[PDB]
Every structure is written in C-alpha cells, then in structure tokens.
C-alpha cells in the first residue's frame, strides 16, 4: 500500500510544481549529462525517466488516454490523482473503510460536481443570431468530396436543426439513421417520430391513443431454439404435446405481471406465439418486434424508460408513454411515426437514396458533419477559473456529505479536501500564501457570491467576470473523468505484481 500511495506521490511531485504558467520546472539528466533539457511538459518528464516502481506504470497509461481527447490538462490529471492517494493514508489507519465504498463515494461526489459546474458555466454563444447563422456555413464546408455537395442549403439545414433542438447530450446515440432504397436524396426530411423499418401486428389497428411503453427482453415463444440432440420418451404421440401445452399455462404468470401495469404497448426482441398474442388482443396490448440494440436503449431515453429485462417487484418500475402512435406507408414499406412523446428530445434523419453506395457515403459523411457542429457545444464554452470552479465543487460535495451513512462519511469528506488542493498548489507557484487565499475563498462562497475567485496578480479575491479569466468546461470534465477512473483501480490494489519487461 505504501508503493501504491506514497510511491505514487513522488511520481506526482514532478508534475506538481510544474502546473500553471508560473509553475516551476524540472531537470532531466542522463549519464553523459550533455543531452539534458529544461521543460515544463509533464508527459515528457514521466516518459523519459525510467520508473523502477512497478506501481508507477499504471499512471503511464492514464496520461495516454487523456492525451487522446485533448492535449491540454495532462499535468492536472496526475496532480489531482496524487491528492486523492495522499489522503488515502488517513483512510486506512484512523478510518478503516473499505476501498470500494470510498470509490462509490467519489461517484456520488462527481455527480454533484458536474451538475454544480453546469449551472455556473458561461459561454460565448450570446447573441445567437450571429452564432446560429454561422452553423450552417460550417457544415457546407465539410461537404467537399462528399456526394451531399449537390445541394448545400437543404442538406446542411437538416444537420443544423439536428443539434440545437437536442437540448442535451450531443452524442450520436440520440440521432437515428435509417437507410432505405427507391428514392432521391432531395426528398429527405427531419422527423422526430422514431421511424423504423419493421411493422407489428396483423389485424390490429394502426393508430394508438395514450400509449404506455414498457421495455423488456424475454423469449415467450419456443425457447431452446435448437432441438437437435434431444430425446423424447413418451407412451403415445398425444402425450408428447402435453409438455408444450403445459408451457402455455405457465405463460399466464408472465402475462399477469404485464397486465397489472396497465400498458397497451409491449417491446420484444424475439417473436411471440399466437396464444400469448391472442390474449393481448382482449387486453389491447400491441407488441413491437426487431428492436435491435440502439432501438432498445434509444426508446428508453426519449420515453423515459428502463433497459432492465426482469421484474424485481410488481407495480414498481420505470414506465414510458406517448400520446399517439401513427403508422404510415412510404416507398412501398410501412413506417412507424410516433407522436406526443413526453419530454422527448431526439431527432431522426431519414436518408432516402437511389442505391446502396449512396447510403453508406451519406451516413459516414453525416457523422463527420455533425461531429463538427456537436464540437461547438464543448468548445468555446468556459467556466470561471482562478480557484472559483475548484471551490464551487467543494460546496456540492459538502451537500452530499450532510446526509450519508457511516462508511462513506469520511470518504466523501476527504474528496472535498482534494478539490481545494488545486488552488493551493497554484498559489504556491505564484509566490503568495496559499493557506490565506484558499481559506478566505471558502467563507465567501459559502454564503452567496458564487462568482468570486482568486486573483494571482493582486493576491486577493476579485470578481472573475470583471477580470475575464476563464477556463474551458470540457477540460474540467476530462480531468475529473480521468481521475475517477485512475483512482478506481489504484485504491482497489491490495498487492503489486511487477510487469514483465518487453
């Protein structure tokens, strides 16, 4: 435990004093001593120095993951992870708390830390009239070499409304893409009705009002799909069908749990036999088939459902709903257009091509076009820096530290101390007193004045909005996510296995 905690601090001490523009520098010296150099880069110092500590090699792969996202903030990841391991010494002797319970306390603290930074985050998106107009011009530049360059106005307009109308996560998991044949690309339009290829039902109506959607995964029709190898021992042919008829009687136990929920719409990945489906007709239950994987997850996001396939207790679950389910037919194929989804946020771009070659090139080019538009949400958006954002996160941790059990009480409280260590180290390299600035900053933000921060030039507390010192919000989440994953493995280590040299 000493090499994984104290031994990891010495690795973080090299990047500790090098954080910030006023930070110190380190020396990398070889045997000949004439090849040396002086630089503040944290990734260069760690990779150049050979590490005989087998526990220090874990932090090497952590810096490589951070460098993939963005080339800034690699130093702050090791420094923040070193403060969590430094306080881990007190988490053993005078605490005696299970390490995984301490990690679970960080997940509850990181959830409130990201929500606290979102409300205090600012952006340059103000005067959106100029901002929203430039979004369509950027998408037209990405249309070069792509078949979508034929019409810039109509094709880029669908990509513009596919971003701002989301009001949430910009990941492609909220956007549905459908590839169909027998049409032209100019007829494509934006529709939120969640259009998919397959239909459902035969004699059932195509319109459903006040629908209740529930997501589950089970096989209700002819389980054990492979019959090869079985041996049927029966006294008569009619006695062999008794096992199949006995299974139909047991189907009422699974149907009764569904009927008690009062849902007219069911989701199934596999098929359904006529008898359990005929019982759904009297109850007015329609089952949707061929939901794949994204169709299962994306349906729970727009309707507010759950992805669990089992029922742990009756009359307790997460249920969705939609106002109207409309089924139309276009291109000689039936389509499913949902309407009136509660709090539904998503978009579905239906690409209608004339062949298979135009569908694959349009989908791959749309992902690259939407990636630039979605990047503008995480880019140029900053937060108040200079100790501000570091202290604001400490207030959200203290809120969770109020109501807590006995095991995670010291774990959540220890995370709040590491958050104040970031402005403490930055104030050390600035040449001023860190204990005086961090202490006065907590008492000010405690009651009101959440925009205050630490001024490095004047060595006092000043308004960050007037000084104009801000730090990117994407950098804040990247460091917390990297520190949460790096500390999750290290705290669970009860023994060290030396890696084999290559």
């Amino acid at each position: 435990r000493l090499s994984a905690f104290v031994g990891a601090i010495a690795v973080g001490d090299l990047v500790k004093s090098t954080l910030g523009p006023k930070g110190m520098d380190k020396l990398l010296q070889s045997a000949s001593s004439n090849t040396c150099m002086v630089t503040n880069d944290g990734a260069t110092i760690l990779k150049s120095i050979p590490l005989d500590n087998p526990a220090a090699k874990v932090l090497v792969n952590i810096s490589k993951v951070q460098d993939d996202e963005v080339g800034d903030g690699t130093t702050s990841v090791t420094v923040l992870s070193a403060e969590l391991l430094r306080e881990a010494e007190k988490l053993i002797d005078q605490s005696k708390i299970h390490p995984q319970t301490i990690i679970e306390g960080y997940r509850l603290a990181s959830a409130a830390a990201l929500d606290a930074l979102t409300k205090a985050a600012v952006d340059n998106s103000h005067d959106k009239t100029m901002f929203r107009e430039d979004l369509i011009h950027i998408a037209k530049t990405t249309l070069s070499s792509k078949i979508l360059s034929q019409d810039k106005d109509h094709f880029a307009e669908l990509a513009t409304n596919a971003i701002l109308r989301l009001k949430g996560s910009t990941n492609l998991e909220h956007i549905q893409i459908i590839k169909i044949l027998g049409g032209k690309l100019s007829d494509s339009f934006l529709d939120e009705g969640f259009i998919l290829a397959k239909k459902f039902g035969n004699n059932q109506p195509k319109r459903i009002e006040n629908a209740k959607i529930l997501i589950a995964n089970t096989t209700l029709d002819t389980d054990k799909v492979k019959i090869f190898g079985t041996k049927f021992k029966v006294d008569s042919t009619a006695k062999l069908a008794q096992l199949e008829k006995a299974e139909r009687e047991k189907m009422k136990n699974k149907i009764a749990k569904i009927s008690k929920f009062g849902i007219n719409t069911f989701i199934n990945r596999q098929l359904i036999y006529d008898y359990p489906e005929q019982l759904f007709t009297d109850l007015g239950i329609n089952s949707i088939e061929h939901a794949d994987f994204e169709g299962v997850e994306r349906l729970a996001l727009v309707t507010g459902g759950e992805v669990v396939s089992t029922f742990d207790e009756p009359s307790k679950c997460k249920l969705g709903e939609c106002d109207v389910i409309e089924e139309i037919m276009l291109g000689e194929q039936p389509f499913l257009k949902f309407s009136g989804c509660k709090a539904g946020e998503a978009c579905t771009i239906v690409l209608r091509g004339a062949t298979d070659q135009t569908l694959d090139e349009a989908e791959r080019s749309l992902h690259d076009a939407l990636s630039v538009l979605s990047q503008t949400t995480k880019e140029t958006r900053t937060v108040l820096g200079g100790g501000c954002a570091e202290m604001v996160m400490s207030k959200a941790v203290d809120t969770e530290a109020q109501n807590i059990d006995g095991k995670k009480s010291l774990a959540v409280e220890a995370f709040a101390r590491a958050l104040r260590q970031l402005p403490t180290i930055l104030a050390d390299n600035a040449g001023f007193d860190s204990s005086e600035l961090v202490s006065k900053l907590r008492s000010s933000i405690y009651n009101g004045i959440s925009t205050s921060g630490l001024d490095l030039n004047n060595g006092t507390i000043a308004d960050m909005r007037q000084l104009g010192i801000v730090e990117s919000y994407k950098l804040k989440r990247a460091v917390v996510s990297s520190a949460s994953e790096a500390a999750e493995v290290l705290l669970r280590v009860d023994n060290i296995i030396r890696a084999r040299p290559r």
Partner: protein, 480 residues
C-alpha cells in the same frame, strides 16, 4: 526543495567568484589543464567556461549566456557572469526570510526593464551620420591589442562597412556575412574592401590556367572533375554542359574523397578561359549562397543559368605569399552588399590576433545600430542605477520593496572588482565615485574610454533571465 537550489547556488557562486578575478586586463588569469595535456592561459570568460567541462547542470547555463553575450553585444562575457553570481549571492538571505522564488524571479525581470530607461535618460544621444564618434569608438577599442599606429587606418574601414549594411530599421545584422580571410604575407597597411565577395583560398597554380577572367558567372557546384570511378571523352561532356550556360567560374567543394580537377580537363578549360577555384570549405558553402544569391548544385542536370551569379572582373592579385582572388560587381539586387575584409601580415601571430581584434571592433559599432548612444565604463553605469533605486525603493510595498534595495547592492560588485584588479582599495575608490556624484554624472571622457550601451543593457537582461531559470528547477533526477 531548498536543499537542491541552495546546493546549485553555492556551486554557481564559486564559479562566478572564480571568473570575477579575471575581470579586466589586469585581472587574475585562470589555468585549465586538459586530460590530454593541453594547458590554455587567457582572461576570456567564454573560453574558460567552455574548456572547464563543468559537471554541474545549472552551472553549464553560463556558457549559453556567455555565447549570447558575445553574439549580441560582443563584450562583457566576464561581467555578465559576475552579475549572475551577484544575484545568486544576495538570494541566499532571501530564502531565509521565507520569500518564494516567484517574487524573486518576477522582480528581476521588472527591474531589468526599468533599468534600461534609466540608462537611456543618462546616455548621450548620438547619430550614425556623424563619423567623428564612429572612428574614435573603434580606434580606442584597439588600444588593448598589439596594433597601435595601424589601428587608426583600420578604423574608417570598419565604419564604412557597417553603415552600408546597417540601413535604419534593419536592427540586428547577421555577422556571418562578414568573413575575415587571413593569409601569410603582405602587411596591415594594404587593405581591400572588395564588397562583392572574398574566398578563403587561392586559384589553380598549374600550367594552362588563365587565373583571370572578365565578365564571368559564379555559382555553387557540388560536382567534381574525376576520371571514371576514353577519359577525355567523359570529361568533354562535363565541360560542354557548362558552356551551354556560359559559366566561366567553377567552385568545387573541398572533399578528401576524390580529387578536384583532372589535369586533362585543364587543357580543355584553357581554350574557353574558364577559371576554376578549388578547396572550398564547407563553412563557405552557406556564405557564398547568401552574398552571391546562388544555390548549391549537386548534379549536372540541376545546373542552370538562372542560378548563376555575375562578376564584372575576376583576377588574381599579385602579392607575396598571398595571391588573393577578388570579385567585384556581383550585380545582385536581392542580395545585400556585405563586406569581406582580407587580413595580411608576415607573421602568423599577426593575422590571428588581428582577426579577433576586428570582431570586437565591429560589434561595438553594431551596438549603435540597434540602440544609439554610449555610456562610459569603469563602474559609471552600475553605480548610476543604484543612485536612482535608493529613493525608488521607498515607494514600493510588500516583499518586492526589499528586493529593490538588494538589487542595487549587487550592482556594486562590478565597480568593486574593477578597483581590486587595479591594485587600488576596493571601498575607498567606490566612495570617491559616489561623493562627486552630487555634481558630476558621467565623469573617463578625457582618457578616451568609451563603451556601448548594448553591453550594459544585455548584461542585465541576460543575467535576469539566467538567475530566473536557476530557481525554477527545484529537483534533479536521472533520466535515460
């Protein structure tokens, strides 16, 4: 982290105090005995620090500071080391008071910028249009060299060479375009400017070589005349492609691999009167590509007419043991008219020290190009800064207020060393300078002792960033 910095400051202070004894011509010379058995003796600070083979990592930074000191200002390589050690010596008590090095580092950069404006107000504003102060500056600077009576003749030659290439807004001028070619024979009184270009070697001494040609083209060619590695047929196509572009001057890069020009090719070039100059050093390859505006040509197919220069007259001047070839009228609008001065003398020890003497003479004149004006040396600019910082230190507040008092005290080390190396009492002479300071200011003018302002300015600027970078390293680890 103090144990790492204090160990580097004490190690650097002993090196700075050792070089401090070498300040001035009367200073104490340091001896260095190499492992091979070679022993050098001189007062140059850059030579001592280069051959000392210092194993201390931070102490090796003084070599880079002394390199930039001679490259920019050209003087004060010893004084910049003394000022660097003076700030490190005063920083020993700063760490005992609990002062973080960031305030120490930020105060040196802020004091270095304010110290320049103080010197400019006390400096006498001069212009480059007046040749009276330009000749007297280079003439008095040569009093430290063997040349005495001949120093007055070389003074206007160095002035007219810089003023042509200085222009106005050019500011820094590359010193690599000025090539001093030393050769045995001749004398100092015989000099030729030859603004076109000057090579480092002679011409072909064999039979058949014209050695002189008028209206010829000069270009860089990396090819070489050699047999196949029948012979006259292979050499015929080589000279035939050169005749297509009418290139009468062939410059072959010196290489020990093969020869330069075959004896059979000399008879072919004698009819066309094509002059060839061999033994071109590798350092002159980049030099000839600038002033002449040509390009190095590796193969025979790369040889073109557009890459060839122009020469009005190429001849071999008759001189004892010299035979220097000159080129005039390069006629290149894109390339600037640089100056290459030929140094001649009977003894080998003459043309050697004469070349080094002209280096410091051109730097002092070049200091006036970047910033005009000059300040007399002898401790005058170092003490004058401390006079203004006495009352200014009271106007500050906080930790930085104490740094201004210690910064003026460290500047007194330079004038104190000048009094010690001259045998006079250290403190007694310094008190006599501050006593008359109430009336006189710059008064050294009657002794014809002049120093450029860039030397005093760069000495403070380089020493400010040096000491700043020393305190930045708090740890030393092994990395391989």
């Amino acid at each position: 982290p103090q144990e790492v910095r204090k160990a580097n400051i004490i190690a650097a202070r002993s090196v700075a105090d050792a070089i401090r004894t070498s300040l001035g011509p009367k200073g104490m010379d340091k001896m260095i005995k190499t492992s091979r058995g070679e022993i050098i003796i001189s007062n140059d600070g850059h030579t001592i620090l280069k051959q000392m083979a210092i194993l201390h990592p931070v102490a090796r930074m003084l070599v880079e500071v002394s390199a930039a000191q001679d490259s920019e200002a050209g003087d004060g390589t010893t004084s910049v080391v003394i000022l660097t050690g003076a700030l490190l010596g005063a920083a020993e008590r700063l760490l005992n008071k609990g002062i973080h090095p960031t305030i120490i580092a930020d105060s040196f950069q802020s004091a270095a910028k304010r110290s320049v404006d103080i010197l400019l107000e006390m400096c006498h504003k001069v212009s480059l249009s007046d040749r009276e102060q330009l000749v007297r500056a280079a003439s008095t600077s040569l009093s430290s060299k063997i040349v005495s009576q001949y120093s007055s003749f070389l003074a206007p030659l160095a002035v007219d060479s810089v003023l042509k290439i200085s222009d106005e807004n050019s500011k820094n001028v590359d010193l690599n375009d000025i090539r001093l070619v030393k050769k045995v024979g001749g004398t100092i009184d015989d000099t030729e400017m030859i603004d076109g270009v000057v090579l480092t070697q002679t011409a072909i001494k064999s039979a058949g070589g014209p050695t002189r040609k008028e209206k010829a083209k000069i270009g860089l060619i990396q090819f070489q005349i050699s047999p196949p590695k029948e012979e006259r047929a292979y050499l015929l196509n080589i000279c035939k492609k050169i005749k297509k572009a009418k290139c009468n001057v062939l410059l072959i890069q010196k290489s020990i691999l093969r020869d330069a020009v075959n004896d059979l090719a000399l008879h072919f070039l004698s009819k066309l009167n094509i002059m060839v100059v061999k033994d071109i050093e590798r350092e002159e390859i980049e030099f000839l590509s600038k002033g002449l505006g040509c390009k190095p040509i590796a193969d025979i197919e790369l040889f073109t007419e557009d890459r060839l220069g122009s020469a009005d007259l190429v001849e071999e001047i008759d001189s004892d043991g010299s035979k220097i070839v000159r080129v005039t009228g390069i006629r290149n609008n894109n390339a600037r008219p640089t100056v290459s001065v030929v140094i001649r003398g009977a003894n080998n020890m003459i043309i050697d020290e004469t070349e080094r003497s002209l280096h410091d003479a051109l730097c002092v004149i070049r200091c006036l190009v970047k910033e005009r004006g000059l300040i007399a040396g002898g401790g005058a600019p170092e003490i004058e800064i401390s006079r203004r910082l006495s009352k200014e230190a009271r106007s500050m507040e906080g930790v930085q207020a104490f740094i201004w008092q210690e910064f003026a005290s460290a500047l007194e080390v330079i004038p104190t060393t000048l009094a010690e190396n001259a045998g006079l009492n250290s403190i007694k002479v310094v008190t006599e300078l501050r006593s008359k300071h109430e009336n006189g200011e710059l008064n050294t003018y009657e002794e014809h002792i002049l120093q450029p302002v860039l030397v005093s300015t760069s000495a403070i600027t380089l020493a400010s960033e040096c000491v700043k970078s020393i305190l930045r390293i708090d740890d030393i680890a092994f990395s391989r």
